[PDB]
Enzyme design. Structure first.
Site: not given
Ligand SMILES: OC[C@H]1O[C@@H](O)[C@H](O)[C@@H](O)[C@@H]1O
Ligand SMILES: OC[C@H]1O[C@@H](O)[C@H](O)[C@@H](O)[C@@H]1O
Ligand SMILES: OC[C@H]1O[C@@H](O)[C@H](O)[C@@H](O)[C@@H]1O
Length: 628
Positions: A284, A328, A286
């Site tokens: 994923r 994401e 992020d």
């Molecule tokens: O790390 C900062 C953010 O990253 C995102 O990918 C997460 O879904 C979230 O929960 C988090 O607060």
């Protein structure tokens, strides 16, 4: 810029003449060599677009390629078989056979050992994909739920050991379930070794982050930066104890990594290879939108960000073909889709569909949803959406203002309504959510709360169970990989301890991160309980989706129902889905259905439906009609 043949001759220079001759004839070197020729061009092109003539690019690249070869050489044979399998089946992510689930190891099963014991349940539910929340070391107390990483390789002791993680992964593969984990590559915790050494002035970690002497540059950057956690701090910077300022898009204890330094890319590519060899199937990616900064811009979705992700993609194509990426990007719809591609992120969250599912429950009008399914659903070949109803995060109303304006809807006023409705500050609302990050300077706000809490299950709304069934039916049938927020299948409600927990009191997202509810799970086979009604309902839909070829693929064509409360779409010109978002009966007229077969079997209710007459759907009823 160099070529694949030349670079490979240098990779082999670490071997003596005798050893080299043996490597040249090895199967691993033959596979690596072939992939290098095919994919290196992309890696070089992407890195060049970002770093250009940087003196450090060539040295970094050669170091990276050397590591990649060593990584592939070490890779387990079983994983290499999966590499070849997916190399020849790019659409494995688009199969209707796939259904995913996500959960926190500690909240759902205590620890990694406990999680392994829950695998039989995952198989029972029908999962073929499992995303485990942040598993590695992080700060004690506040760590943004594990998203503030202090180590990419040492497992959080509370969850277990790296050994336990390997056993879990092996057990998941044995059960036919892909292992999905986070690649938190935009930032690390302020306690991470790299962060400490960078701030300390260690030349080895120079420029690994964005640190400034005063507010001069931060003030300039803040003119165009969007605030993610305005409750924590303004703009995108936090101040160190020595007076300097550091770029912190999220919490102050989360320092943004500096990808403008080629050595940071190499470092993160190394961590990616480590995860790859643990057997991870999907990473994923992020906060992909934030990996590149540029004064005068929003520092989101910049060209170099996309290029860096494509460079990471190429590394996997060369050293671990089985590893796919999940983007994401919770941003504007026009930007969300730009991360999705065979050479970038093969799959990606679909926040637009998700946000609009909730919008439609509130307004009872499918206009926005129909618009999205009509113009923003289909994707390029070999890519797919990850469709969901809820996640560990808050709900943001990320629909496009431009799209809404075409429908005569004011984005700003509309979000004001949606926010009031879902936090129970609107007359008659059935939702019981809580606000998240209300920003008085922009009026923006997001919503926290479990799916059950938002549909009214907390107060036993007679329509709650049906609302849950309707929302999940759409994520399961529109085309793409559906992701179940584990706990939703038995109607789990909000956690009511978070508000008084000093480590969670300032982050309402914990409201929808409850622990495994033993009582509800024990009721999943009892049809007289909400838990059993929801479970059997969702399990049935999952069963149908995975066994029926009419759901295969990710393309869809919308159907004009001529009823503002009923959504309609067709899959593979063989499955007609209707969803009633009204709490009252709604009809699709015989006139509207004239081109359809006279009869059609409904997979949801299991009955034969006549389409040569008015079709009336009960409140929140969903029908999956086989028209071919
Ligand atoms: O790390 C900062 C953010 O990253 C995102 O990918 C997460 O879904 C979230 O929960 C988090 O607060
Ligand atoms: O509640 C009645 C109406 O209020 C408006 O503010 C909303 O934007 C609209 O969607 C809703 O139907
Ligand atoms: O033939 C079926 C189609 O007839 C069209 O003329 C109608 O406008 C449409 O609503 C109906 O779906």
């Amino acid at each position: 810029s160099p070529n694949s043949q030349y670079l490979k001759t240098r990779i082999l220079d670490i071997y003596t003449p005798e050893q080299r001759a043996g490597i040249e004839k090895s199967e691993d070197w033959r596979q690596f060599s072939r992939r290098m020729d095919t994919h290196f061009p992309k890696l070089m092109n992407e890195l060049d677009s970002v770093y250009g003539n940087n003196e450090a690019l060539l040295p970094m690249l050669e170091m990276l390629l050397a590591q990649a070869w060593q990584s592939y050489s070490q890779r387990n044979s079983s994983l290499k078989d999966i590499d070849i399998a997916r190399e020849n089946n790019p659409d494995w992510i688009l199969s209707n056979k796939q259904v995913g689930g996500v959960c926190y190891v500690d909240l759902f099963a205590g620890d990694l050992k406990g999680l392994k014991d829950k695998i039989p349940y995952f198989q029972e539910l029908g999962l073929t994909y499992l995303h485990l929340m942040p598993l590695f070391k992080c700060p004690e107390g506040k760590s943004d739920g594990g998203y503030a990483v202090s180590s990419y390789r040492d497992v959080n002791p509370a969850l277990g050991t790296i050994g336990d993680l390997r056993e879990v992964i092996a057990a998941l593969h044995e059960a036919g379930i892909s292992a999905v984990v986070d690649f938190i590559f935009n930032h690390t915790s302020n306690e991470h070794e790299w962060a400490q050494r960078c701030a300390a002035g260690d030349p080895l970690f120079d420029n690994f982050y964005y640190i400034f002497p005063d507010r001069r540059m931060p003030d300039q950057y803040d003119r165009t930066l969007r605030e993610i956690f305005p409750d924590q701090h303004p703009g995108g910077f936090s101040q160190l104890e020595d007076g300097r300022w550091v770029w912190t898009t999220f919490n102050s204890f989360q320092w943004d990594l500096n990808y403008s330094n080629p050595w940071v890319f190499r470092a993160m590519a190394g961590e990616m290879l480590f995860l790859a060899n643990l057997g991870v199937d999907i990473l994923r990616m992020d906060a992909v939108a934030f990996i590149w900064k540029q004064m005068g811009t929003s520092c989101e979705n910049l060209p170099q960000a996309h290029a860096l992700i494509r460079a990471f993609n190429a590394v996997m194509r060369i050293a671990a073909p089985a590893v796919f990426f999940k983007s994401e990007a919770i941003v504007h719809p026009d930007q969300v889709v730009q991360y999705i591609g065979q050479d970038e992120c093969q799959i990606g969250y679909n926040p637009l569909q998700m946000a609009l599912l909730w919008n439609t429950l509130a307004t009872r009008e499918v206009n926005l949803l129909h618009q999205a399914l009509t113009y923003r659903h289909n994707l390029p070949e070999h890519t797919a959406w990850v469709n969901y109803v809820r996640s560990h995060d808050d709900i943001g109303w990320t629909f496009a203002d431009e799209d809404a304006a075409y429908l005569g809807i004011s984005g700003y006023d509309h979000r004001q309504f949606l926010n009031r409705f879902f936090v129970n500050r609107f007359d008659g609302s059935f939702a019981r959510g809580v606000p998240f990050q209300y920003n008085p300077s922009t009026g923006d706000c997001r919503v926290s709360g479990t799916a059950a809490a938002l549909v009214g299950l907390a107060q036993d709304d007679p329509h709650a169970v049906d609302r849950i069934k309707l929302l999940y039916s759409i994520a399961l049938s529109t085309g793409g990989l559906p992701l179940i927020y584990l706990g939703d299948e038995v109607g789990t409600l909000n956690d009511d301890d978070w508000s008084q927990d000093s480590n969670k009191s300032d982050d309402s997202r914990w409201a929808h991160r409850p622990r495994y509810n033993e009582a509800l799970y024990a009721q999943r086979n009892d049809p007289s309980t909400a838990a059993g009604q929801i479970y059997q309902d969702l399990r049935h839909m999952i069963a149908v989706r995975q066994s029926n070829p009419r759901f295969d693929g990710g393309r869809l064509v919308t159907f004009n129902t001529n009823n503002k409360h009923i959504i309609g779409y067709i899959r593979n010109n063989a499955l007609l889905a209707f969803g009633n978002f009204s709490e009252y009966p709604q009809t699709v007229t015989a006139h509207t259905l004239q081109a359809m077969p006279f009869k059609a079997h409904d997979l949801i209710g299991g009955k034969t439906v006549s389409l040569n007459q008015d079709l009336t759907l009960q409140p929140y009823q969903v029908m999956w009609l086989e028209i071919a």
